[PDB]
A paper describes a structure:
EV-[name] is an atypical enterovirus that usually causes mild respiratory tract disease, but is also associated with severe lower respiratory tract infections and acute flaccid myelitis. Following receptor binding and endocytosis, virus particles uncoat by forming a proteinaceous pore spanning the endosomal membrane through which they eject their genome into the cytosol. In this study, we showed that EV-[name]-947 is a dual receptor-binding virus that can use both sialylated glycans and sGAGs as receptors. Structures of EV-[name]-947 were determined after incubation of the virus either in the absence of a receptor analogue, with 6′SLN (a sialylated trisaccharide), with dp6 (a heparin-derived hexasaccharide), or with LMWH at 33 °C.
Full and empty particles in cryo-EM images were counted. e Structure of EV-[name]-947 empty capsids formed in the absence or presence of LMWH. VP2 residues 53–60, 98–100, and 240–242 and VP3 residues 148–150, which line the hole around the two-fold axis, are less ordered in emptied particles formed after LMWH treatment than in those formed without ligand. Incubation of EV-[name]-947 with sGAG analogues not only caused pocket factor displacement but also promoted genome release, by enlarging the putative openings for genome egress at the two-fold axes via a yet unknown mechanism.
Residue numbers in the entry:
A (entry chain C): 17 to 27, 32 to 42, 53 to 222, 224 to 242
B (entry chain B), C (entry chain B): 1 to 175, 184 to 234, 236 to 246
D (entry chain B): 1 to 50
E (entry chain A), F (entry chain A): 53 to 78, 87 to 129, 135 to 289
Amino acid sequence: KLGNSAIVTQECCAYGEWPNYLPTQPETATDRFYTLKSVKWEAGSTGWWWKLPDALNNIGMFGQNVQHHYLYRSGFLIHVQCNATRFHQGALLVVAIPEHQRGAHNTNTSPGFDDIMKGEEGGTFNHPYVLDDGTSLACATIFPHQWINLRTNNSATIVLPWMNAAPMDFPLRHNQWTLAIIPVVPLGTRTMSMVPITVSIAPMCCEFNGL
Amino acid sequence: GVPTYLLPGSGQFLTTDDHSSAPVLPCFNPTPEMHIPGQVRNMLEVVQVESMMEINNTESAVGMERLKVDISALTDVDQLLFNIPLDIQLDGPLRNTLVGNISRYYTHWSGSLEMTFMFCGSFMATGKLILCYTPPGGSCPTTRETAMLGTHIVWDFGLQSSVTLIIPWISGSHYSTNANVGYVTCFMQTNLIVPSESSDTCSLIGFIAAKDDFSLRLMRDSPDIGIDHLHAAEAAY
Amino acid sequence: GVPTYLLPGSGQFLTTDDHSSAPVLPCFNPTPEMHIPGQVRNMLEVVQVESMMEINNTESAVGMERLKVDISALTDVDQLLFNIPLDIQLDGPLRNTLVGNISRYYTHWSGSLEMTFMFCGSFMATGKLILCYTPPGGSCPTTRETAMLGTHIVWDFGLQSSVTLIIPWISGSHYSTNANVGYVTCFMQTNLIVPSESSDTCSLIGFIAAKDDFSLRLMRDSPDIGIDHLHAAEAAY
Amino acid sequence: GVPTYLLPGSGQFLTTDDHSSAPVLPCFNPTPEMHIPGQVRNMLEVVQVE
Amino acid sequence: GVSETLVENFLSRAALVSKRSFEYKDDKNFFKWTINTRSFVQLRRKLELFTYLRFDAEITILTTVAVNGYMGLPNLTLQAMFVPTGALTPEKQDSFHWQSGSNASVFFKISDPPARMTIPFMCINSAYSVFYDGFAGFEKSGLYGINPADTIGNLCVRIVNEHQPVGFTVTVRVYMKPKHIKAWAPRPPRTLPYMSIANANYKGKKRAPNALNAIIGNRDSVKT
Amino acid sequence: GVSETLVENFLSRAALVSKRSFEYKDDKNFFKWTINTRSFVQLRRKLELFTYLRFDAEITILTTVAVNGYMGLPNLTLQAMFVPTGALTPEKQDSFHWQSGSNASVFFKISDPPARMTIPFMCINSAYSVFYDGFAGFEKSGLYGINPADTIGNLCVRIVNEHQPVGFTVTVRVYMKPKHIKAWAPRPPRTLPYMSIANANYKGKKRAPNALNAIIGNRDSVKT
């Protein structure tokens, strides 16, 4: 439970690291679930990707601690929930890619500022089979990942530790992680369904230096 | 001083030698080791992670459609759905996995693989699948009744949603040559019973991870990568 | 005798190597170490000494006039006097100091600098100066009222004659490229109140010293020195 | 055997060097040191004489 | 090592990274090389299995010589000078910058064993960001994935001897070999062919294997 | 070292100090060099950060050879002889003074590794007076700043072989590298360009930077 906004209930972690503080350390301002917009998962939906903390420069006391702090240091605690009934079938891969250097298809030109920086809007995979960077989705379970199989569960929980070689980073140009939700098995029902996928990001162990 | 004489093999650059050498910038203190999460000390931590097989391997399977095998209500009672040739050193479903991209950097692999299938249909979808493991050299089953020969399990995906199928020791390339190295075969047992509101075309996805006894040795370069000229050629010069 | 073989990298003159070598005049006793005062064992004793910044950096500032910023009775209540870009690796007020001529022999600098200003007006001169530190990437203040954003101090030079302004950790070249690396900004707060007998054009001088946590690493040659032919050329031959 | 590499300054004849060298007639016993009077161990015995 | 799957053994095979048959006669009289991971795609695909690395590269300059279509091969003197990410490179073959008292040259002859220096962990951060999801500097014009805390350095190599060296072409091979490798956060192995040495663009082959829409070669049916 | 700011590490980079492509044929057949601090202004500006020094210079003679605009390069024998501040230098290339039983020659071949001797702390006083505020000797004609307790020595180098060596020009590089540096009383770094190798004259550039009346490049105003 994080912040005055009681949203979801957690205690799956990642990299064996529950976040601890390894100066401004927010614990009631930023440590709260910033629920994003719920994206409509249909039958022909390819994927979605949110680059953290680029998705949180806009929203909340974390967003004020980006515009008023030059260097940040934060781990995350993320929570994806896919509210579908007992007649929907489908499977998501909620994968959290560290340093997702995306690729541009078929050209020699690197991605620009308006292909990598989206923010709260998120984005969408174009070739999700190779994760938009030439690798493979079939091997993409080496990351911190979690399965939303709508037969079994409908929710996910990944913890994202501080993933930089640097001790602290500046937020408006670099993005550590990349939450990415790829429907492996596409959604099915006979009526032919816009099932929503709600993403709540909660920062953990925030530090901010340089007013 | 010290009377020394030169052995044969003196002055050679053997590429895989390991001697201490002259630092080009001594009295430099590099940046200390900040605790970065998720260290790999051994590539058998990378291999033992599960990863999706590509079990719908047909022609006209485009993109994401290749990972998942569709079963439906209009399949025969004991129609063969798929089979997985265990060519971890060659072409097949296992080539683009974690267990089969690290083991293409090696020559001899050996250990128990671990398959995990996961049904991805609706909550009401019931039926059974029989999952046969054919040991190498044996006969690939066609009838469901002659499929009872070695190890096989009847998997009811109405109750379970995921089964784990241990493949035993295989010992690898102990014989470059095409042969018969195992199969994992999955027939329909009953039918697909979905209600009138769920979609009648359900799907399976399959995973593979090596276990603790997996052992790779003798290192060679990967056959996967090659082909053409790259952009920014000579731009590092 | 001893069977030896030559490693690759044998017979090379690496310029930064450190082996004991053959003395050209052995059984020579050089002059003993008489205790000469003021030894430097570390260049961070040379850096941490304060030294004058050059904060009046304009055109038509000739010679000694460049070190001191003139304030006078005919300046606006909140007119900007100076700002100090913290380009310790580049051009600016900090280039000809002790902290910024040793740190041009290096590549990565990091630590708390320490600025010290010293008012050099008459004994009766009163007034206040507000001294803003703008952290890097931030906005350079123009109005005195929006100048209250980060660290800043109101310095009354009627009471004090010297203020100490710690600049915090900066970490240096962690990003050869122009950017925004800090500012120290000093506005008028009140006015300059000198009596009718003292001179109405007072002056400030500013100092900078690195603190104990200053750290330089990776050594390169200085960009400052170069250009032309020297006198007594070939007179050492 | 022993992995060695040649430093710069290898193969040079520096005239004022002092290493043990190869005797041209080993297993030769030279004449022992008969006590000859007036040894000079230091040239500051030669200088300090008037 | 204990196993041959250990990361120290998996990566520290000495790999060729540069090869410049530079012609010296009487800019083009020498070569430099930006030391980067992205040179030869056999080693590049192995270093891009990991996100963060920390390795002391050793560099083993092998210099050959060959007569063009005079019977003896001259024993020249060379200079492989490691310019880091700091001061300037020599603009000419005999400029002032070769005589720098800070760049650490090596002075090796052709008839010696191959020269060898060890460039240490050369970064600002605690690891090499192999993949960088950000932008350099401040502008929107900073290219994607180019971190200045990733360039190991430069390696300017020249022939020390003077001109009129007549048409014996000097082919210089340079072998990088990581040491003390500590590798963090592994990644999926790249399956599509490369486009540039700068970024991770993807095009695929025309048909399977290693194509965009099908990575494994197509069998006839699932019951094959 | 413990830090890279330590004085032993700050100064002991090996720097080029002499380079004489002396032509030997059948005074001018050899070269000498007065060993002094004031040779190359990249190292000179670092030694003039301090007032008093105490360093064992090592000298690493690198000898090359090159054919002029005959296909093989001859492997000559050289002699780098350290004449201190005492007895006479050889006036010719084959005089009597090369055969001196007190000057400590080295006898190195071209095809060897580079020769290397270590000249110790060579002074009369307890330190090298880099800056000397006095006058030599007794007269008013003693020049300013020239201390006889500052010359390290001389370094006469010749080719040992006889004449008729035909037009292969011998370029000899000499690398000084201080050792065991003890440095006393630091100084302001010199900001104006040099005039001579003898004294500290100052002229400045024409305009800033590094000019007489303005050392930092002029910005437009103080509120820039």
